[PDB]
Amino acid sequence: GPIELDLDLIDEDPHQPRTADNPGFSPESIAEIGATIKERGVKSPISVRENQEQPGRYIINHGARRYRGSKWAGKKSIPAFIDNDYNEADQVIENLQRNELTPREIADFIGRELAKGKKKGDIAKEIGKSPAFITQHVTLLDLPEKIADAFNTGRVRDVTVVNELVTAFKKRPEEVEAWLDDDTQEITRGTVKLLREFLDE
Amino acid sequence: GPIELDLDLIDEDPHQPRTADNPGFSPESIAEIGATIKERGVKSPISVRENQEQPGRYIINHGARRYRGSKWAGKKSIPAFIDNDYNEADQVIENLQRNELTPREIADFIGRELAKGKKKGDIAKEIGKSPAFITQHVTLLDLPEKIADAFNTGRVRDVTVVNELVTAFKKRPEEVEAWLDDDTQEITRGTVKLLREFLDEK
Ligand SMILES: Nc1ccn([C@@H]2O[C@H](COP(=O)(O)OP(=O)(O)OP(=O)(O)O)[C@@H](O)[C@H]2O)c(=O)n1
Ligand SMILES: Nc1ccn([C@@H]2O[C@H](COP(=O)(O)OP(=O)(O)OP(=O)(O)O)[C@@H](O)[C@H]2O)c(=O)n1
Ligand SMILES: [Cl-]
Ligand SMILES: [Cl-]
Ligand SMILES: [Cl-]
Ligand SMILES: [Cl-]
Ligand SMILES: [Cl-]
Ligand SMILES: [Cl-]
Ligand SMILES: [Cl-]
Ligand SMILES: [Cl-]
Protein backbone atom coordinates (compact mmCIF):
# COMPACT_ATOMS: atom_id res chain seq x y z
CA GLY A 1 0.00 0.00 0.00
CA PRO A 2 0.83 3.79 -0.15
CA ILE A 3 1.55 5.49 3.17
CA GLU A 4 -0.63 8.32 4.49
CA LEU A 5 2.00 10.96 5.23
CA ASP A 6 1.36 13.98 7.48
CA LEU A 7 1.65 17.15 5.34
CA ASP A 8 3.60 18.71 8.24
CA LEU A 9 6.46 16.27 7.54
CA ILE A 10 6.79 17.18 3.85
CA ASP A 11 8.83 19.89 2.16
CA GLU A 12 8.75 20.97 -1.45
CA ASP A 13 11.95 20.56 -3.44
CA PRO A 14 13.33 24.07 -4.11
CA HIS A 15 15.08 22.78 -7.29
CA GLN A 16 11.92 21.25 -8.80
CA PRO A 17 11.60 22.28 -12.50
CA ARG A 18 8.20 23.92 -11.98
CA THR A 19 8.82 27.53 -10.92
CA ALA A 20 6.65 30.00 -8.97
CA ASP A 21 5.51 31.67 -12.22
CA ASN A 22 4.01 28.41 -13.58
CA PRO A 23 0.21 28.66 -14.28
CA GLY A 24 -0.19 25.41 -12.35
CA PHE A 25 0.85 27.08 -9.09
CA SER A 26 -1.67 29.93 -9.48
CA PRO A 27 -4.26 30.04 -6.65
CA GLU A 28 -7.02 29.20 -9.15
CA SER A 29 -5.15 26.12 -10.42
CA ILE A 30 -4.43 24.80 -6.92
CA ALA A 31 -8.13 25.40 -6.12
CA GLU A 32 -9.08 23.35 -9.17
CA ILE A 33 -7.05 20.26 -8.29
CA GLY A 34 -7.87 20.88 -4.64
CA ALA A 35 -11.61 20.52 -5.20
CA THR A 36 -11.08 17.11 -6.81
CA ILE A 37 -8.93 16.08 -3.86
CA LYS A 38 -11.56 17.27 -1.38
CA GLU A 39 -14.16 15.15 -3.24
CA ARG A 40 -12.19 12.07 -4.41
CA GLY A 41 -8.83 12.14 -2.59
CA VAL A 42 -5.39 12.10 -4.16
CA LYS A 43 -5.73 9.27 -6.66
CA SER A 44 -2.02 9.09 -7.69
CA PRO A 45 0.13 8.95 -4.53
CA ILE A 46 3.06 11.40 -4.53
CA SER A 47 6.70 10.32 -4.53
CA VAL A 48 8.97 11.53 -1.73
CA ARG A 49 12.52 10.96 -0.58
CA GLU A 50 13.68 10.84 3.01
CA ASN A 51 15.31 14.10 4.09
CA GLN A 52 18.90 13.14 4.98
CA GLU A 53 19.40 16.45 6.82
CA GLN A 54 16.25 16.17 9.00
CA PRO A 55 15.32 12.50 9.61
CA GLY A 56 11.57 11.94 10.01
CA ARG A 57 10.82 14.50 7.25
CA TYR A 58 10.44 14.01 3.49
CA ILE A 59 11.20 15.99 0.28
CA ILE A 60 8.93 15.84 -2.77
CA ASN A 61 10.17 14.00 -5.85
CA HIS A 62 6.92 14.63 -7.75
CA GLY A 63 3.60 15.86 -6.35
CA ALA A 64 3.83 19.55 -5.38
CA ARG A 65 0.42 20.42 -6.88
CA ARG A 66 -1.15 17.39 -5.22
CA TYR A 67 0.52 18.58 -2.03
CA ARG A 68 -0.72 22.16 -2.31
CA GLY A 69 -4.14 20.94 -3.42
CA SER A 70 -4.24 18.67 -0.38
CA LYS A 71 -3.64 21.68 1.89
CA TRP A 72 -6.27 23.72 0.03
CA ALA A 73 -8.77 20.90 0.62
CA GLY A 74 -8.08 20.88 4.34
CA LYS A 75 -6.34 17.49 4.32
CA LYS A 76 -4.07 16.49 7.18
CA SER A 77 -2.21 13.83 5.15
CA ILE A 78 -1.37 12.70 1.61
CA PRO A 79 -0.90 9.25 0.05
CA ALA A 80 2.74 8.73 -0.80
CA PHE A 81 5.53 6.28 -1.53
CA ILE A 82 9.18 6.59 -0.65
CA ASP A 83 11.67 6.52 -3.54
CA ASN A 84 15.24 7.46 -2.64
CA ASP A 85 16.45 6.62 -6.18
CA TYR A 86 14.96 9.66 -7.89
CA ASN A 87 16.93 12.37 -9.74
CA GLU A 88 16.29 15.77 -11.30
CA ALA A 89 15.75 14.30 -14.78
CA ASP A 90 13.03 12.01 -13.39
CA GLN A 91 11.17 15.16 -12.28
CA VAL A 92 11.10 16.41 -15.86
CA ILE A 93 10.06 12.94 -17.11
CA GLU A 94 7.07 12.89 -14.67
CA ASN A 95 5.77 15.94 -16.46
CA LEU A 96 6.79 15.60 -20.13
CA GLN A 97 6.05 11.87 -20.62
CA ARG A 98 2.24 12.10 -20.74
CA ASN A 99 -0.49 12.65 -23.31
CA GLU A 100 -3.88 14.31 -23.09
CA LEU A 101 -7.33 13.06 -23.98
CA THR A 102 -8.48 14.66 -27.22
CA PRO A 103 -11.43 17.10 -27.25
CA ARG A 104 -13.50 14.40 -28.98
CA GLU A 105 -12.70 11.89 -26.23
CA ILE A 106 -13.68 14.40 -23.55
CA ALA A 107 -16.90 15.31 -25.37
CA ASP A 108 -17.77 11.62 -25.78
CA PHE A 109 -17.23 11.00 -22.07
CA ILE A 110 -19.56 13.90 -21.33
CA GLY A 111 -22.00 12.45 -23.89
CA ARG A 112 -22.08 9.06 -22.14
CA GLU A 113 -22.84 10.83 -18.83
CA LEU A 114 -25.60 12.96 -20.37
CA ALA A 115 -27.12 9.81 -21.92
CA LYS A 116 -27.40 8.33 -18.43
CA GLY A 117 -29.33 11.44 -17.39
CA LYS A 118 -26.58 13.22 -15.41
CA LYS A 119 -26.83 17.02 -15.27
CA LYS A 120 -24.10 19.18 -16.84
CA GLY A 121 -23.51 20.71 -13.40
CA ASP A 122 -22.71 17.31 -11.87
CA ILE A 123 -20.53 16.33 -14.82
CA ALA A 124 -18.49 19.52 -14.23
CA LYS A 125 -18.08 18.59 -10.58
CA GLU A 126 -17.04 14.96 -11.03
CA ILE A 127 -14.13 15.93 -13.35
CA GLY A 128 -13.23 19.12 -11.48
CA LYS A 129 -13.92 21.47 -14.38
CA SER A 130 -16.13 24.49 -14.92
CA PRO A 131 -19.59 24.44 -16.56
CA ALA A 132 -18.12 26.53 -19.38
CA PHE A 133 -15.61 23.76 -20.09
CA ILE A 134 -18.49 21.25 -20.29
CA THR A 135 -20.46 23.57 -22.59
CA GLN A 136 -17.54 23.99 -24.98
CA HIS A 137 -17.07 20.22 -25.31
CA VAL A 138 -20.83 19.47 -25.54
CA THR A 139 -20.83 21.57 -28.72
CA LEU A 140 -18.81 18.76 -30.33
CA LEU A 141 -21.66 16.25 -29.84
CA ASP A 142 -23.96 17.93 -32.40
CA LEU A 143 -21.83 19.72 -34.95
CA PRO A 144 -23.36 21.14 -38.14
CA GLU A 145 -22.49 18.85 -41.03
CA LYS A 146 -19.77 20.85 -42.80
CA ILE A 147 -18.08 21.80 -39.50
CA ALA A 148 -18.19 18.15 -38.41
CA ASP A 149 -16.25 17.14 -41.54
CA ALA A 150 -13.61 19.81 -40.88
CA PHE A 151 -13.32 18.63 -37.28
CA ASN A 152 -13.05 14.94 -38.16
CA THR A 153 -10.53 15.39 -41.01
CA GLY A 154 -8.37 17.41 -38.56
CA ARG A 155 -8.72 20.64 -40.60
CA VAL A 156 -9.55 22.24 -37.22
CA ARG A 157 -8.81 20.62 -33.86
CA ASP A 158 -9.11 23.32 -31.18
CA VAL A 159 -12.40 23.16 -29.27
CA THR A 160 -12.50 26.95 -28.79
CA VAL A 161 -12.15 27.57 -32.52
CA VAL A 162 -14.84 24.98 -33.30
CA ASN A 163 -17.19 26.71 -30.86
CA GLU A 164 -16.46 30.11 -32.49
CA LEU A 165 -17.23 28.54 -35.88
CA VAL A 166 -20.52 27.06 -34.67
CA THR A 167 -21.57 30.38 -33.09
CA ALA A 168 -20.96 31.98 -36.49
CA PHE A 169 -22.84 29.17 -38.29
CA LYS A 170 -25.96 29.73 -36.15
CA LYS A 171 -26.19 33.39 -37.23
CA ARG A 172 -25.08 33.02 -40.88
CA PRO A 173 -25.12 29.32 -42.03
CA GLU A 174 -24.87 29.84 -45.79
CA GLU A 175 -21.86 32.17 -45.47
CA VAL A 176 -19.89 29.87 -43.14
CA GLU A 177 -20.59 26.86 -45.39
CA ALA A 178 -19.22 28.73 -48.44
CA TRP A 179 -16.14 29.74 -46.41
CA LEU A 180 -15.49 26.07 -45.53
CA ASP A 181 -16.16 25.00 -49.15
CA ASP A 182 -12.89 26.72 -50.16
CA ASP A 183 -10.04 24.21 -49.93
CA THR A 184 -7.33 26.93 -49.66
CA GLN A 185 -9.00 28.31 -46.50
CA GLU A 186 -7.12 27.35 -43.34
CA ILE A 187 -8.99 27.33 -40.02
CA THR A 188 -7.21 29.06 -37.14
CA ARG A 189 -8.09 31.26 -34.14
CA GLY A 190 -7.07 34.08 -36.53
CA THR A 191 -9.00 33.24 -39.72
CA VAL A 192 -12.19 32.69 -37.72
CA LYS A 193 -11.69 36.04 -35.94
CA LEU A 194 -11.48 37.51 -39.48
CA LEU A 195 -14.69 35.72 -40.49
CA ARG A 196 -16.62 36.98 -37.45
CA GLU A 197 -15.64 40.56 -38.28
CA PHE A 198 -16.50 40.20 -41.99
CA LEU A 199 -20.02 39.13 -40.94
CA ASP A 200 -20.69 42.19 -38.70
CA GLU A 201 -19.97 44.75 -41.52
CA GLY B 1 5.66 0.71 -0.85
CA PRO B 2 4.12 -0.06 -4.33
CA ILE B 3 3.75 -3.69 -5.34
CA GLU B 4 5.68 -5.07 -8.31
CA LEU B 5 2.73 -6.62 -10.17
CA ASP B 6 3.16 -9.28 -12.88
CA LEU B 7 2.02 -7.75 -16.20
CA ASP B 8 0.35 -11.09 -16.98
CA LEU B 9 -2.16 -10.45 -14.16
CA ILE B 10 -3.28 -7.10 -15.54
CA ASP B 11 -5.86 -6.22 -18.18
CA GLU B 12 -6.66 -2.86 -19.69
CA ASP B 13 -10.06 -1.31 -19.00
CA PRO B 14 -12.05 -1.44 -22.27
CA HIS B 15 -14.13 1.62 -21.17
CA GLN B 16 -11.07 3.80 -20.36
CA PRO B 17 -11.61 7.33 -21.79
CA ARG B 18 -8.50 7.15 -24.00
CA THR B 19 -9.52 5.52 -27.30
CA ALA B 20 -7.47 3.59 -29.88
CA ASP B 21 -7.12 6.71 -32.08
CA ASN B 22 -5.43 8.72 -29.30
CA PRO B 23 -1.90 9.99 -30.27
CA GLY B 24 -0.66 8.61 -26.95
CA PHE B 25 -1.37 5.03 -28.03
CA SER B 26 0.61 5.38 -31.28
CA PRO B 27 3.62 2.99 -31.51
CA GLU B 28 5.98 6.00 -31.54
CA SER B 29 4.40 7.40 -28.33
CA ILE B 30 4.58 4.05 -26.53
CA ALA B 31 8.24 3.79 -27.66
CA GLU B 32 8.92 7.23 -26.21
CA ILE B 33 7.54 6.50 -22.72
CA GLY B 34 8.91 2.97 -23.00
CA ALA B 35 12.51 4.22 -23.36
CA THR B 36 12.17 6.18 -20.11
CA ILE B 37 10.80 3.07 -18.42
CA LYS B 38 13.62 0.92 -19.75
CA GLU B 39 16.13 3.44 -18.34
CA ARG B 40 14.47 4.73 -15.13
CA GLY B 41 11.49 2.48 -14.38
CA VAL B 42 7.90 3.50 -13.99
CA LYS B 43 8.26 6.32 -11.48
CA SER B 44 4.50 6.83 -10.83
CA PRO B 45 2.95 3.44 -9.94
CA ILE B 46 -0.23 2.55 -11.81
CA SER B 47 -3.58 2.14 -10.06
CA VAL B 48 -5.48 -1.14 -10.48
CA ARG B 49 -8.66 -2.73 -9.12
CA GLU B 50 -9.30 -6.38 -8.37
CA ASN B 51 -11.23 -8.11 -11.12
CA GLN B 52 -14.43 -9.40 -9.45
CA GLU B 53 -15.12 -11.71 -12.42
CA GLN B 54 -11.64 -13.31 -12.57
CA PRO B 55 -10.05 -13.73 -9.11
CA GLY B 56 -6.30 -13.14 -9.00
CA ARG B 57 -6.38 -10.63 -11.88
CA TYR B 58 -6.55 -6.83 -12.00
CA ILE B 59 -8.06 -4.10 -14.18
CA ILE B 60 -6.30 -0.79 -14.83
CA ASN B 61 -7.76 2.29 -13.20
CA HIS B 62 -5.04 4.57 -14.59
CA GLY B 63 -1.77 3.51 -16.25
CA ALA B 64 -2.39 2.01 -19.72
CA ARG B 65 0.53 3.89 -21.37
CA ARG B 66 2.81 2.95 -18.49
CA TYR B 67 1.57 -0.60 -18.96
CA ARG B 68 2.21 -0.69 -22.70
CA GLY B 69 5.50 1.14 -22.29
CA SER B 70 6.50 -1.45 -19.70
CA LYS B 71 5.87 -4.22 -22.24
CA TRP B 72 7.80 -2.30 -24.92
CA ALA B 73 10.73 -2.02 -22.49
CA GLY B 74 10.77 -5.76 -21.83
CA LYS B 75 9.57 -5.47 -18.23
CA LYS B 76 8.04 -8.51 -16.52
CA SER B 77 6.29 -6.43 -13.82
CA ILE B 78 5.02 -2.91 -13.12
CA PRO B 79 4.84 -0.86 -9.88
CA ALA B 80 1.22 -0.61 -8.78
CA PHE B 81 -1.22 0.07 -5.98
CA ILE B 82 -4.67 -1.41 -5.51
CA ASP B 83 -7.62 0.99 -5.33
CA ASN B 84 -11.05 -0.67 -5.45
CA ASP B 85 -12.85 2.64 -4.96
CA TYR B 86 -12.13 4.16 -8.36
CA ASN B 87 -14.77 5.23 -10.90
CA GLU B 88 -14.94 6.34 -14.53
CA ALA B 89 -14.85 10.03 -13.62
CA ASP B 90 -11.61 9.48 -11.65
CA GLN B 91 -10.05 8.22 -14.91
CA VAL B 92 -10.84 11.54 -16.60
CA ILE B 93 -9.55 13.44 -13.53
CA GLU B 94 -6.17 11.59 -13.66
CA ASN B 95 -5.71 13.04 -17.11
CA LEU B 96 -7.29 16.51 -17.04
CA GLN B 97 -6.05 17.61 -13.57
CA ARG B 98 -2.43 18.27 -14.52
CA ASN B 99 -0.36 21.16 -15.85
CA GLU B 100 2.72 21.33 -18.06
CA LEU B 101 6.11 22.92 -17.46
CA THR B 102 6.40 26.06 -19.58
CA PRO B 103 8.87 26.22 -22.51
CA ARG B 104 11.04 28.57 -20.39
CA GLU B 105 11.13 26.04 -17.55
CA ILE B 106 12.16 23.26 -19.93
CA ALA B 107 14.83 25.42 -21.59
CA ASP B 108 16.20 26.43 -18.18
CA PHE B 109 16.41 22.80 -17.07
CA ILE B 110 18.34 22.03 -20.26
CA GLY B 111 20.51 25.12 -19.54
CA ARG B 112 21.41 23.80 -16.09
CA GLU B 113 22.43 20.44 -17.60
CA LEU B 114 24.52 22.08 -20.35
CA ALA B 115 26.25 24.21 -17.68
CA LYS B 116 27.38 21.01 -15.96
CA GLY B 117 28.90 19.89 -19.26
CA LYS B 118 26.27 17.32 -20.28
CA LYS B 119 25.93 16.88 -24.06
CA LYS B 120 22.62 17.65 -25.81
CA GLY B 121 22.36 13.99 -26.86
CA ASP B 122 22.47 12.79 -23.23
CA ILE B 123 20.01 15.47 -22.17
CA ALA B 124 17.60 14.19 -24.84
CA LYS B 125 18.00 10.64 -23.53
CA GLU B 126 17.51 11.38 -19.82
CA ILE B 127 14.17 13.13 -20.44
CA GLY B 128 13.04 10.74 -23.20
CA LYS B 129 12.80 13.41 -25.91
CA SER B 130 14.35 13.90 -29.32
CA PRO B 131 17.42 16.02 -30.17
CA ALA B 132 15.12 18.28 -32.18
CA PHE B 133 13.07 18.93 -29.03
CA ILE B 134 16.27 19.90 -27.17
CA THR B 135 17.34 22.17 -30.05
CA GLN B 136 14.02 24.00 -30.12
CA HIS B 137 14.20 24.74 -26.38
CA VAL B 138 17.91 25.64 -26.43
CA THR B 139 16.95 28.50 -28.78
CA LEU B 140 15.22 30.09 -25.78
CA LEU B 141 18.54 30.36 -23.85
CA ASP B 142 19.96 33.08 -26.12
CA LEU B 143 17.13 35.02 -27.70
CA PRO B 144 17.76 38.24 -29.64
CA GLU B 145 16.75 41.21 -27.51
CA LYS B 146 13.45 42.23 -29.10
CA ILE B 147 12.26 38.61 -29.42
CA ALA B 148 13.17 37.99 -25.77
CA ASP B 149 10.89 40.90 -24.71
CA ALA B 150 7.99 39.52 -26.78
CA PHE B 151 8.56 36.07 -25.27
CA ASN B 152 8.76 37.32 -21.67
CA THR B 153 5.74 39.65 -21.90
CA GLY B 154 3.74 36.66 -23.26
CA ARG B 155 3.17 38.35 -26.65
CA VAL B 156 4.29 34.99 -28.07
CA ARG B 157 4.47 31.80 -26.00
CA ASP B 158 4.83 28.88 -28.42
CA VAL B 159 8.37 27.51 -28.71
CA THR B 160 7.87 26.57 -32.38
CA VAL B 161 6.83 30.10 -33.30
CA VAL B 162 9.73 31.60 -31.35
CA ASN B 163 12.16 29.36 -33.23
CA GLU B 164 10.61 30.43 -36.56
CA LEU B 165 10.96 34.07 -35.49
CA VAL B 166 14.63 33.65 -34.54
CA THR B 167 15.38 31.90 -37.85
CA ALA B 168 13.85 34.91 -39.62
CA PHE B 169 15.81 37.34 -37.40
CA LYS B 170 19.12 35.70 -38.35
CA LYS B 171 18.55 36.38 -42.06
CA ARG B 172 16.84 39.80 -41.80
CA PRO B 173 17.31 41.37 -38.30
CA GLU B 174 16.33 44.97 -39.08
CA GLU B 175 13.06 43.90 -40.77
CA VAL B 176 11.98 41.52 -37.96
CA GLU B 177 12.71 44.19 -35.33
CA ALA B 178 10.48 46.70 -37.18
CA TRP B 179 7.74 44.05 -37.46
CA LEU B 180 7.82 43.52 -33.66
CA ASP B 181 7.91 47.31 -33.09
CA ASP B 182 4.31 47.51 -34.38
CA ASP B 183 1.88 47.15 -31.47
CA THR B 184 -1.05 46.03 -33.67
CA GLN B 185 1.01 43.07 -34.95
CA GLU B 186 -0.03 39.83 -33.28
CA ILE B 187 2.43 36.92 -33.24
CA THR B 188 0.97 33.57 -34.36
CA ARG B 189 2.02 30.51 -36.38
CA GLY B 190 0.12 32.32 -39.18
CA THR B 191 1.54 35.86 -39.02
CA VAL B 192 5.08 34.49 -38.83
CA LYS B 193 4.40 32.25 -41.87
CA LEU B 194 3.36 35.52 -43.61
CA LEU B 195 6.58 37.22 -42.48
CA ARG B 196 8.81 34.36 -43.69
CA GLU B 197 7.27 34.62 -47.16
CA PHE B 198 7.49 38.44 -47.27
CA LEU B 199 11.26 38.12 -46.61
CA ASP B 200 11.98 35.38 -49.18
CA GLU B 201 10.98 37.85 -51.95
CA LYS B 202 13.08 40.90 -51.11
N1 LIG C 1 9.21 6.48 -16.57
C1 LIG C 1 8.03 7.06 -16.41
C2 LIG C 1 7.50 7.96 -17.38
C3 LIG C 1 6.27 8.47 -17.15
N2 LIG C 1 5.58 8.15 -16.02
C4 LIG C 1 4.24 8.70 -15.73
O1 LIG C 1 3.33 8.06 -16.58
C5 LIG C 1 2.15 8.88 -16.70
C6 LIG C 1 1.63 8.79 -18.11
O2 LIG C 1 0.37 9.44 -18.17
P1 LIG C 1 -0.59 9.31 -19.43
O3 LIG C 1 0.07 9.75 -20.68
O4 LIG C 1 -1.87 10.03 -19.16
O5 LIG C 1 -0.74 7.69 -19.51
P2 LIG C 1 -1.24 6.60 -18.44
O6 LIG C 1 -2.05 7.37 -17.47
O7 LIG C 1 -0.13 5.74 -17.97
O8 LIG C 1 -2.30 5.81 -19.37
P3 LIG C 1 -3.92 6.13 -19.54
O9 LIG C 1 -4.05 7.69 -19.29
O10 LIG C 1 -4.36 5.76 -21.00
O11 LIG C 1 -4.66 5.28 -18.40
C7 LIG C 1 2.56 10.27 -16.16
O12 LIG C 1 2.00 10.42 -14.87
C8 LIG C 1 4.07 10.18 -16.04
O13 LIG C 1 4.59 10.95 -14.96
C9 LIG C 1 6.11 7.24 -15.12
O14 LIG C 1 5.43 6.94 -14.14
N3 LIG C 1 7.35 6.74 -15.30
N1 LIG D 1 -7.60 14.11 -7.39
C1 LIG D 1 -6.46 14.07 -8.05
C2 LIG D 1 -6.20 14.99 -9.10
C3 LIG D 1 -5.06 14.82 -9.80
N2 LIG D 1 -4.18 13.83 -9.47
C4 LIG D 1 -2.87 13.71 -10.15
O1 LIG D 1 -2.12 14.87 -9.82
C5 LIG D 1 -1.08 15.00 -10.81
C6 LIG D 1 -0.85 16.45 -11.14
O2 LIG D 1 0.32 16.50 -11.98
P1 LIG D 1 0.98 17.91 -12.19
O3 LIG D 1 0.06 18.97 -12.70
O4 LIG D 1 2.20 17.63 -13.00
O5 LIG D 1 1.31 18.26 -10.64
P2 LIG D 1 2.17 17.47 -9.53
O6 LIG D 1 2.94 16.44 -10.27
O7 LIG D 1 1.25 16.98 -8.42
O8 LIG D 1 3.23 18.55 -9.00
P3 LIG D 1 4.84 18.87 -9.52
O9 LIG D 1 4.82 18.38 -10.99
O10 LIG D 1 4.94 20.41 -9.43
O11 LIG D 1 5.94 18.09 -8.67
C7 LIG D 1 -1.51 14.11 -11.99
O12 LIG D 1 -0.81 12.87 -11.94
C8 LIG D 1 -2.97 13.77 -11.67
O13 LIG D 1 -3.41 12.55 -12.27
C9 LIG D 1 -4.41 13.00 -8.40
O14 LIG D 1 -3.53 12.17 -8.11
N3 LIG D 1 -5.58 13.11 -7.73
CL1 LIG E 1 10.99 29.62 -8.53
CL1 LIG F 1 -7.29 13.60 6.25
CL1 LIG G 1 -0.54 15.84 -25.43
CL1 LIG H 1 -26.63 20.60 -40.62
CL1 LIG I 1 -11.29 2.37 -28.67
CL1 LIG J 1 11.34 -6.67 -14.41
CL1 LIG K 1 -1.31 22.40 -18.98
CL1 LIG L 1 20.45 41.48 -30.03
Residue numbers in the entry:
A (entry chain A): 52 to 252
B (entry chain B): 52 to 253
Question: What does the literature reporting this entry say, word for word?
Answer:
Long-range gene regulation by the DNA-binding protein KorB is important for stable vertical inheritance and horizontal transmission of the broad-host-range multidrug resistance plasmid RK2, as well as for the fitness of its host bacterium. However, in contrast to ParB, KorB also functions as a long-range silencer, repressing the expression of plasmid genes that promote replication and conjugative transfer. The best understood KorB-mediated transcriptional repression requires a 16 bp silencer sequence called OB (operator of KorB) and the small DNA-binding protein KorA that binds site specifically to a 12 bp OA sequence (operator of KorA). We find that KorB binds CTP to form a protein clamp that can entrap and slide along DNA to mediate long-range transcriptional repression, likely by allowing KorB to reach target promoters from distal OB sites.
As KorB harbours a widely distributed ParB N-terminal domain (NTD), we sought to determine whether it binds and hydrolyses CTP. Isothermal titration calorimetry (ITC) showed that KorB binds CTP with moderate affinity (KD = 4.5 ± 0.5 μM) and approximately tenfold more tightly to a non-hydrolysable analogue cytidine-5′-(3-thiotriphosphate) (CTPɣS) (KD = 0.4 ± 0.1 μM) but qualitatively much weaker to cytidine diphosphate (CDP). We then solved a 2.3 Å resolution co-crystal structure of CTPɣS with a KorB∆N30∆CTD variant that lacks the N-terminal peptide (N30) and the C-terminal domain (CTD) to locate CTP-contacting residues. Furthermore, CTP hydrolysis was abolished in the CTP-binding mutant R117A and also in the CTP-binding proficient N146A. In the presence of CTP, canonical ParB self-engages at the NTD to create a clamp-like molecule. We similarly observed dimerization of NTDs from opposing KorB subunits (with a substantial interface area of ~2,097 Å2), supporting a potential clamping mechanism. Based on the KorB∆N30∆CTD–CTPɣS co-crystal structure and sequence alignment between KorB and C. crescentus ParB, residue S47 at the NTD was substituted by cysteine on an otherwise cysteine-less KorB background. Overall, our data suggest that the ability of KorB to bind CTP and close the clamp to slide on DNA is crucial for long-range gene silencing.
